[PDB]
Amino acid sequence: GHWSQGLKISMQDPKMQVYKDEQVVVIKDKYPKARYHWLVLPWTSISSLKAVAREHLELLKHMHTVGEKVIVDFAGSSKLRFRLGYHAIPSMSHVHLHVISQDFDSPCLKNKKHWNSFNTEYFLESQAVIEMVQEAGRVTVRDGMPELLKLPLRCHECQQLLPSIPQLKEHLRKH
Amino acid sequence: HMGHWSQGLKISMQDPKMQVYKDEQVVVIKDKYPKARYHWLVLPWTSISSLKAVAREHLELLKHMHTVGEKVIVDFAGSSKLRFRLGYHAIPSMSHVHLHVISQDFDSPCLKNKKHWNSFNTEYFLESQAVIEMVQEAGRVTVRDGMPELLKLPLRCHECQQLLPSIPQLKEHLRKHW
DNA sequence: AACAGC
DNA sequence: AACAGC
Ligand SMILES: Nc1ncnc2c1ncn2[C@@H]1O[C@H](COP(=O)(O)O)[C@@H](O)[C@H]1O
Ligand SMILES: Nc1ncnc2c1ncn2[C@@H]1O[C@H](COP(=O)(O)O)[C@@H](O)[C@H]1O
Ligand SMILES: [Zn+2]
Ligand SMILES: [Zn+2]
């Protein structure tokens, strides 16, 4: 479906370009799952994590550095915590780096898949991906990622199990 | 002060037809809505308002209630080989403190919602022995905070610790341990 | 009105 | 006193 190309379309639209250089583009996540949620995409598209090889190393490092720069330039005075990583089995085409604040306070965060895709090992940290390409030369993704998306809701700050999304969002207010 | 319905245990325990066991100290009745194949309530003739009211004077009575519970198990469920737990609900709904004696099959149609499950499978369920130890060491029973929150915890099998998303799936899962 | 978009 | 039946 044409919906899966949204990232390539949006990153080519100057009105959506939070940041741009000769290597990458940054856009706001159209349906953000937190107060701050950006996506970093390279101009030279990569199909999936399986296609990543050592030639992509510096680019991945650049995507990480740019993500941290966007935090400084557009959320510097914030005390929030941030994580940078990739979804093991994404839905939108063209690999993209998630840069998202750990409040997870947003109406677009609506279901269990949303939560677990940022708060389970389904969320592959950027620094860990960079490490695999630097040493092994490829990105290895363990099995069972679809099951992680169906796990009961667990708080990422205190590890408490919650029974529903609404009760989770109320719990997050304590942190 | 709650309505007349909360006195059902006092009315039922005085009915000889409901008495599974009786002595000068305690009485045993079958739970009217059992949450397992075997489910009894042990109540003293000298009623206790709540766990907060328990003092060292009730210690021997509490141990007698426990021992009687253990005897009812062997007398009426000895051939079942089922596991049992003895404890009190931290925040009961029926008046008059009563000791739960329940088999761990949890195979019953009266078990219908999460509150039922977590009332017997979280810290909401205070083991009889633990209650006895507190009264022994400290002379009173202390209920920890956050009990209403425990009743909302996702369903967890008490045998293999697996988390289940619904009651019907839990009942189906429990088959594997019978 | 219908529909491909390289 | 509980409790259908209105
Ligand atoms: N047109 C778009 N522009 C920006 N972000 C988008 C767009 N469409 C989807 N997204 C986001 O991209 C992410 C795709 O998820 P995933 O495929 O798991 O990486 C989600 O956070 C979506 O909200
Ligand atoms: N008339 C009754 N006779 C025997 N058990 C009852 C009766 N009414 C309620 N119960 C049980 O007493 C318990 C009351 O809940 P709790 O106050 O949490 O111990 C539940 O297990 C009920 O099924
Ligand atoms: Zn928490
Ligand atoms: Zn189990």
Numbering used by the authors:
A (entry chain A): 165 to 339
B (entry chain B): 163 to 340
Sentences from the paper on this structure:
The APTX RNA‐DNA deadenylase protects genome integrity and corrects abortive DNA ligation arising during ribonucleotide excision repair and base excision DNA repair, and APTX human mutations cause the neurodegenerative disorder ataxia with oculomotor ataxia 1 (AOA1). The aprataxin (APTX) RNA/DNA polynucleotide deadenylase directly reverses 5′‐AMP damage (Ahel et al, 2006; Harris et al, 2009; Reynolds et al, 2009; Tumbale et al, 2011, 2014) and associates with DNA repair scaffolds XRCC1 (Cherry et al, 2015) and XRCC4. Environmental and metabolic sources of DNA damage prompt “abortive ligation”, the failure of ligase to complete step 3, and generation of 5′‐adenylated (5′‐AMP) DNA strand breaks (Ahel et al, 2006; Andres et al, 2015; Schellenberg et al, 2015). AOA1 mutations map to the APTX catalytic domain (Barbot et al, 2001; Moreira et al, 2001; Shimazaki et al, 2002; Le Ber et al, 2003; Tranchant et al, 2003; Criscuolo et al, 2004, 2005; Ito et al, 2005; Mosesso et al, 2005; Baba et al, 2007; Yokoseki et al, 2011) and cause variable age of disease onset.
We obtained crystals diffracting to 2.4 Å resolution that contain two APTX catalytic domain (APTXcat, residues 165–342) protomers engaging a doubly nicked target structure. Successful crystallization strategies ultimately utilized a concatemerized nick substrate with a 6 bp upstream and 8 bp downstream duplexes. In addition, a 5′‐ribonucleotide is positioned at the nick junction. In this configuration, the structural snapshots captured in our crystal structures are representative of APTX bound to a nicked RNA‐5′‐3′‐DNA junction reaction product complex formed by APTX during repair of abortive ligation products created during ribonucleotide excision repair (RER) (Tumbale et al, 2014; Schellenberg et al, 2015). The structure reveals how APTX induces large‐scale DNA duplex substrate distortions in order to access the 5′‐terminal adenylated lesion in the context of a nicked duplex. The major molecular interface at the DNA nick is mediated by the amino‐terminal HIT domain α‐helix (α1) that infiltrates the DNA base stack. The planar rings of His166 and Trp167 together redirect the DNA duplex, imparting a ~90° bend to the substrate RNA‐DNA. The protein displaces the upstream half of the nick and unwinds both the 3′ and 5′ sides of the nick. This has two effects: First, extraction of the 5′‐terminus facilitates positioning of the adenylated lesion into the active site; and second, disruption of the 3′‐terminal side of the nick exposes the 3′ end. In each of the complexes captured in our crystals, abrupt DNA bending is governed by the APTX amino‐terminal helix, as previously hypothesized (Tumbale et al, 2011). This structure illuminates how APTX senses DNA damage through two discontinuous nucleic acid binding sub‐sites, dictated by both the HIT and Znf domains which together collaborate to sense the nick.
